[PDB]
Amino acid sequence: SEYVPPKVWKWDKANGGAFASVNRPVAGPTSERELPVGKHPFQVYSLGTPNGQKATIMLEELLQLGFSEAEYDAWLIKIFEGDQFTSGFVDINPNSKIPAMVDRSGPEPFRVFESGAILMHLAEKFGVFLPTSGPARAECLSWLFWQVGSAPFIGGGFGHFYNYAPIKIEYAIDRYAMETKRLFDVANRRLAESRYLAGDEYTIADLATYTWFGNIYRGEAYGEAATFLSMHEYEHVGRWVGEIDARPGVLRGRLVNSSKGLAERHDASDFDALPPESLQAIVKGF
Amino acid sequence: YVPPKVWKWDKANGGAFASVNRPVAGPTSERELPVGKHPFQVYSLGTPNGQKATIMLEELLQLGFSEAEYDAWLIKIFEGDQFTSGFVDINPNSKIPAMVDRSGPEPFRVFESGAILMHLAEKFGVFLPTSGPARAECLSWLFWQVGSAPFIGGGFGHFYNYAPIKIEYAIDRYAMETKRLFDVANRRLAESRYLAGDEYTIADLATYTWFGNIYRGEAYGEAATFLSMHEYEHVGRWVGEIDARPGVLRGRLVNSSKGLAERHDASDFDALPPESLQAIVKGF
Ligand SMILES: N[C@@H](CCC(=O)N[C@@H](CSSC[C@H](NC(=O)CC[C@H](N)C(=O)O)C(=O)NCC(=O)O)C(=O)NCC(=O)O)C(=O)O
Ligand SMILES: N[C@@H](CCC(=O)N[C@@H](CSSC[C@H](NC(=O)CC[C@H](N)C(=O)O)C(=O)NCC(=O)O)C(=O)NCC(=O)O)C(=O)O
């Protein structure tokens, strides 16, 4: 018979599949441990998921343009193991999610958390990948906030119910597969008539959406999702993914804090530990 | 059940929203948007997300910024108004709120509540530090709100209040996450008056519309009891402080069944009984 929710919700059962070892109804630190700090002006604490890739790609894009103040240390945070709940991590992101960073480029350090805030902070600092004024700024912000507000349906809904939940729940898989397809259709309809999401040039709105959409579209995210969701239908998404795939900052940034690349980045020469081909073409994750 | 190799749109989904939710985007009717006299044209509904936009504009009017005068036209989301050609042209995602900035020589769209908040805060130089570390703190909390409300509304609200069958695993997932998010805010507000510092900013406004509506018992049936809202005393303090702001008291009523269907001039509020603008009862 049908489940009847209690009057008062209680945390009486594991939830999250593999993530049941970390998912809780309360926030805060579970151990006292300071974060490591390197020599570079930006300190990033992350994992090479689509959200971590936004941050490390952005920094590599800035280095591609010659901005030495974008040099960074990218320290590995293993989210299945609860590294996001150390006191040091909670102090830089009260929400205990990656990516989070400390801007140590000025006289006093300060935290920046949330991938969208990291992208906007870096774009504003260096004056690139985000129009500084005018209608084009509003268009870019609209698409960036769209990405941030919609990825929860893609990863927290579809990815979870399709690939991590311990039981396959038809209503939930249908809900979030449908919504993920709708979001791809929004992008596809836009990219039919515009080279990039917020205009004719690559911006942070593209980078933010690309990490998620490219990983799903090319077949590397959530099991058989690309077949399940009929990714072939989104040919304009495919074109735009292909354009962005070719950018050197994307090729480098995708490899940071990645099981297919570097565990950590502490200097530009660190990439010489990888096969050189990894810097020249997309490497799909496991 | 066993998912098929290829997902097909062959079953209803969405419960109360089953008549509007689709796997495809784009318009379902040809209709132009109405346009009024004021510099900002808002197309919205007084849900927590619409309230962000109309409260922000009312906050700006409280500060005397006449360029924040606005027309707020009603978009009925259960009726598919978000899929007219005119609405899709200002928000390709077909969600409220969306806006047209007609304050300058050429009009342009702004869509997403967070982008609307940032656009207005940057235009008028208020509710968002213009530079310095405090700007980064504000942006962090604003993006946090935008990235987490989907779990509260699209997860918890959906499965607890709108889905046709109660699904234990899904209710647990999103009840747990909603409580975690309230706990993040509660732990912050234990040590800070507002989320991003000592002053009210757009990060507070964005979070407040959602958190206050739930905390006070107004959203999602018995959710406030279900989620033990009493546990979050610092959230309660902050809700009560923001509840008292004159711009909140006005803006929360715009495009609302319990207030004004539409707003086309400041005097529109005079048509309501004066009690409508009076102190919000606590539960904060
Ligand atoms: N808005 C934030 C989001 C940052 C974020 O979610 N970071 C996580 C790693 S990215 S992998 C995709 C992620 N899935 C999970 O986090 C799984 C654990 C989660 N608790 C769950 O049960 O689903 C996802 O779906 N993100 C949605 C989104 O990006 O909007 C992370 O650090 N998780 C740690 C955790 O404890 O949850 C931003 O943009 O920065
Ligand atoms: N990131 C956007 C979100 C704007 C938005 O979602 N606007 C909707 C009205 S606000 S009511 C809360 C909303 N719930 C729904 O939209 C219900 C319908 C939906 N299709 C569903 O099945 O759940 C919600 O949970 N929002 C989550 C969030 O704020 O992140 C809206 O216009 N819905 C119309 C539609 O067709 O979906 C922003 O901040 O602006």
Author numbering:
A (entry chain A): 8 to 293
B (entry chain B): 10 to 293
Q: Paper's wording?
A:
Toward this end, we tested sphingomonads for the ability to break the β-aryl ether bond commonly found in lignin and identified and characterized a Nu-class glutathione S-transferase from N. aromaticivorans that acts as a glutathione lyase in the process (NaGSTNu). Here, we find that Nu-class GSTs from N. aromaticivorans (NaGSTNu) and Sphingobium sp. In addition, this is the first demonstration of a Nu-class GST having a defined physiological role as a glutathione lyase in an organism.
In NaGSTNu, seven residues make close contacts with GSH1 (Thr51, Asn53, Gln86, Lys99, Ile100, Glu116, and Ser117), and three residues make close contacts with GSH2 (Asn25, Asn53, and Arg177 from the opposite chain in the dimer). In NaGSTNu, a short channel connects the active site to the solvent. The C-terminal Phe288 resides near the active-site channel in one subunit (NaGSTNu closed) and ∼18 Å away from the channel entrance in the other (NaGSTNu open), resulting in a difference between the monomers in the opening to the active-site pocket. The closed NaGSTNu configuration is stabilized by hydrogen bonds between Lys286 and both Lys262 and Arg220. For both GS-HPV stereoisomers, there are predicted hydrogen bonds between the γ-hydroxyl and the hydroxyl of Tyr224 and between the HPV phenolic group and the carboxyl group of the C-terminal Phe288.
